[PDB]
Amino acid sequence: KLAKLDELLRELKEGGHRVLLYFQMTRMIDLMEEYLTYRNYKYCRLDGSTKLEDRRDTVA
C-alpha cells in the first residue's frame, strides 16, 4: 500500500491535486506521518486523540 500510495501521491502532487487520507488505525497515522516528514509534503492531522480547538484550527 505505502509503495502504491507513494507513487500515487507523486502523480497527484505533480498533478497539483490535494488529498484526504483515511485510516482505520491511528498508529498508521503515526507511521504515515513519519513518511510524510521524510518527504517534501506539507500536511495536517486529525484523529480521536486531538483536542477540539486543534480540530477547529487544523481544518481552518
Added chain:
DNA sequence: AGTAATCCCCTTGGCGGTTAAAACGCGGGGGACAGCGCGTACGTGCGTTTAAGCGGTGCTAGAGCTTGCTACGACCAATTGAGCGGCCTCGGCACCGGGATTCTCCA
C-alpha cells in the same frame, strides 16, 4: 460477546519571573565542658526479728455445663422523607497601614 477507537479528566511535566526564604560571612558572647575541692549521702557488713513461704486441714461460694423456650433480632417487600449534591451570597476573617504601646539593652 470481544477489542479498539474516541473522548473526558486529572495527573505529571516544563517555562518564565519574581520575590520571598536559604545560604554565606563575620564578630563576640556566653554557654559547653573540663578541672578542682568537699561533704554528705549511698553501698557495705553485722546482729536482730519479722513474717513470707511451705505442708496441711476445712468449708462453700460460684465457675462451668446442660435443658427448655420464648423473647428478640435477621430477613423481605412497600413506603417516604431525611440526608446528599449542586447553586448562591453575604459576612466573617485576613490582610494591610498607620499611630500607640511595650520591651529590650546599653548607659
